[PDB]
């Protein structure tokens, strides 16, 4: 049951307790799992009286290549447990790559607890700063409308989708958000591009009670308000006659919107007046729901450049910074949300995992061992190494964070980061340049429609016979299947090498499937990654997914807004 004072107090106490709880968090992560096969090769049994030291002396640092095979052992028909343990309900993917290649990571309900709690705490501390009405609502540009089942019958999932479609999402969320403007089925609509249109339309629906404008990111927000600049006239027409636009093609969500419409002419007069009085749409957000106290999203690091376009949108509305962590482990929260996005810092929540840091101080890099969480130095910059229930044990995520300060006995962290970057050599390519070129080549068939392609991804399916490729396109809107089907042909026809040629021409690798998905799938990807706990070097999205990449992969199937197999060949 969510309450303000007790939750912050236990938080305050938990944070000064930082060491007990960090140290105890290590105990229960390994008490829960003293049975890791990985730890057997490290020689663990648990308990002891040098247990912490035992883990740091015996258990070697690890990468995405070394964790790839095991968590891949989990996902593909071997429903088998490995590095953490139990066959997790779902699985993960990570930005940058495991050598240009896919990285799987485990999901257990614990990551839901961390979620509900960290949002419990983040919302509480912010409603302390930005108090909301108990009967209001919110414009949440949130989506998770896609769920795919990996080749063994095992689900692998995105941080978005697994919160949202989780059995405890709704009941756990009731008390600490103002109710969602979007019916769940439009949030979970097989068309989140049309649903984002319906999400605008939803946030726009109870505007006066709406208490904030949300996206995980400023770019998510910017994408919505740049798009809102595009389509407002069309939107006035839709809500107007009681009839939704012919743009909307899926029946469940059309059933939802027709459950919501009647012919109403007066407000069209209104909206036209306001939308055309503004200066290049500056101050647009308070223009819509004037009475939202805040714009909320991650503002730091690689999304700093999306803060001002959003500021342009936000007017004078305060921009509050979101907290820090992921499926790969939550790290930090904003218990002082009132600070500016350029002075923005996030503070660690301790029982989520056992975290250790790599000092970069010597030159670059520097051969130093990791020190305790509060043994980390103020002002200096360390990389994050993650231990928890998520399949990470003393693992290097690959990114640099600054210790600006301390909230009581728990340290405030800062991110000036972007790309976890070095790369290595791929095999989900088909040269990255060929894949980018591939999308670039057929996409102009779409550019004929005054649209542009916003983002893309790809997949290798070896459950099937013959196995096939999948390409995914995020774009500016709805259009007919015939061009898309044409487009799929060009992706195929854009892989320039002799090789793709030999197979599919003979046909031993199946005809590539272009599964057109909807707006902000890769925004779901960006949003989960930077917010992901380690340090904003989290954004180079992986382009083609081997049987070892899962985050984009749950988001992969269910919003097949269309999915077509080349009628060529």
């Amino acid at each position: 049951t969510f309450d303000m004072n007790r939750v912050i107090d236990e938080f305050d106490e938990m944070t000064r307790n930082a060491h007990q709880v960090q140290k105890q968090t290590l105990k229960e992560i390994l008490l829960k799992n003293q049975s890791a096969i990985y730890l057997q090769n490290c020689g663990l049994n648990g308990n002891a009286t040098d247990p912490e030291e035992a883990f740091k002396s015996m258990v070697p640092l690890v990468t995405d290549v070394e964790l790839e095979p095991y968590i891949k052992r989990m996902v593909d028909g071997d429903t088998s447990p490995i590095l953490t343990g139990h066959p997790v309900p779902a699985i993960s993917l990570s930005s940058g790559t495991s050598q240009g290649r896919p990285k799987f990571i485990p999901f257990t309900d614990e990551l839901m607890e961390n979620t509900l709690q960290l949002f419990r705490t983040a919302f509480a501390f912010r409603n302390r700063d930005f108090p909301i009405d108990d009967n209001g609502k919110a414009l949440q540009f949130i989506f998770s409308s896609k769920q795919y089942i990996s080749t063994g019958g095992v689900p692998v999932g995105t941080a978005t989708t697994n919160v949202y479609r989780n059995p405890n999402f709704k009941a756990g969320m009731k008390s600490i958000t103002s109710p969602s403007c979007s019916p769940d089925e439009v949030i979970f609509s097989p068309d989140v591009h049309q649903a984002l249109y319906c999400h605008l339309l939803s946030g726009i629906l109870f505007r006066d009670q709406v208490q904030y404008v949300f996206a995980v990111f400023a770019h998510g927000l910017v994408h919505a308000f740049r798009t809102f600049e595009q389509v407002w006239e069309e939107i006035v027409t839709d809500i107007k006659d009681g009839v939704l636009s012919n743009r909307i093609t899926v029946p469940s969500v059309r059933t939802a919107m027709s459950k919501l419409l009647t012919p109403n002419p007066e407000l069209a007069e209104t909206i036209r007046t306001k939308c055309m009085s503004l200066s290049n749409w500056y101050g647009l957000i308070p223009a819509l729901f004037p009475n939202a106290k805040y714009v909320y999203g991650i503002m730091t690091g690689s999304m700093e450049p999306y803060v001002p376009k959003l500021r342009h949108y936000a007017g004078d509305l305060p921009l509050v910074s979101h907290d820090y962590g992921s499926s790969e482990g939550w790290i930090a929260a904003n218990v002082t949300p009132r600070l500016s996005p350029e002075e923005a810092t996030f503070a660690v929540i301790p029982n989520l995992g056992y975290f250790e840091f790599l000092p970069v101080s010597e030159t670059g890099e520097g051969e130093e061992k990791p020190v305790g969480l509060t043994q980390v130095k103020i002002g200096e910059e360390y990389e994050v190494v993650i231990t928890n229930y998520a399949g990470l044990y003393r693992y290097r995520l690959g990114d640099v964070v600054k210790v600006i300060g301390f909230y009581n006995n728990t340290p405030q962290l800062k991110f000036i980061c972007r790309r976890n970057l070095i790369l290595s050599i791929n095999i989900d390519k088909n040269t990255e340049r060929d894949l980018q070129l591939s999308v670039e080549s057929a996409a102009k068939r779409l550019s004929e429609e005054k649209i542009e392609v916003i983002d893309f991804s790809s997949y290798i399916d070896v459950s099937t016979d013959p196995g096939h490729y999948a390409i995914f396109w995020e774009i500016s809107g709805e259009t007919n299947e015939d061009v898309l089907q044409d487009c799929c042909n060009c992706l195929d026809r854009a892989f320039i090498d002799a090789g793709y040629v030999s197979s599919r021409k003979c046909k031993t690798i199946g005809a590539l499937e272009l599964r057109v998905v909807a707006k902000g799938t890769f925004r779901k990807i960006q949003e989960h990654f930077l917010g992901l706990g380690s340090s904003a070097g989290q954004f180079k999205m992986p382009r083609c997914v081997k049987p070892s990449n899962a985050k984009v992969l749950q988001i992969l199937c269910e919003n097949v807004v269309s999915s077509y197999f080349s009628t060529a060949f």
Binding site: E440, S441, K444, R445, E448, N489, A568
Partner: protein
């Protein structure tokens, strides 16, 4: 500075623009109101009054295919649309004539007319895209080992494919896929990628033509 007399939906005007842009010329477009054909146009073709018209050295160059080979001969140092052999030239010209005949009227039939007329034009273009797909065979293009003469000639039809698809209520891709397939490939050249207007509009132009003449 070359001055082009052009029309936002002329597939032929697009032949000219594509050909020139394919080559490397910096030129100017002047959009035509055919209700009011221009003074320089009425002087370029006083009888046809038809575009595309490229004006070089103050000398009017007319007809779309004519203009594109004018493209070839006017700057013969960089990007040739023909191969070296005369036979290859005759093949590309030969195949240039092909797009101009049953292909263009059949499409003219698919989006411009209906009923008894439409189905005839309809089987005519599937037949065309079929012999077309047969000669395309494998080559990335047509008139040589790279972007060709006739590449320019039939690529500009690929924005009207959307009109043909909807008014014909067809899908020209499942019968001959590699052709439209070759088309969005050809869209990656900066010549067609900036010279050719939006298809939804082109569809809408065909819709204006249709609503006027029922």
């Amino acid at each position: 500075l070359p001055i082009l007399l052009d029309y936002w939906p002329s597939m032929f005007g697009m032949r000219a623009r594509v050909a020139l842009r394919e080559k490397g010329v910096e030129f100017e477009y002047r959009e035509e109101d055919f209700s009011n054909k221009s003074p320089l146009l009425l002087q370029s073709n006083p009888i046809h009054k038809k575009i595309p018209v490229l004006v070089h050295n103050g000398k009017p160059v007319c007809e779309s295919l004519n203009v594109v080979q004018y493209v070839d001969e006017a700057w013969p140092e960089k990007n040739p649309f023909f191969p070296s052999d005369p036979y290859g030239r005759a093949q590309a010209r030969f195949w240039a004539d092909f797009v101009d005949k049953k292909f263009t009227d059949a499409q003219f039939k698919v989006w411009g007319k209906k009923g008894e007329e439409q189905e005839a034009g309809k089987k005519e273009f599937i037949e065309a895209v079929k012999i077309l797909e047969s000669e395309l065979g494998d080559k990335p293009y047509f008139g040589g080992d790279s972007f060709g003469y006739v590449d320019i000639s039939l690529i500009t039809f690929s924005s009207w494919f959307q009109a043909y698809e909807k008014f014909g209520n067809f899908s020209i891709e499942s019968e001959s896929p590699k052709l439209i397939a070759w088309a969005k490939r050809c869209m990656e050249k900066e010549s067609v990628s900036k010279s050719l207007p939006d298809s939804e509009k082109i569809v809408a132009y065909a819709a204006e033509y249709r609503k006027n003449n029922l």
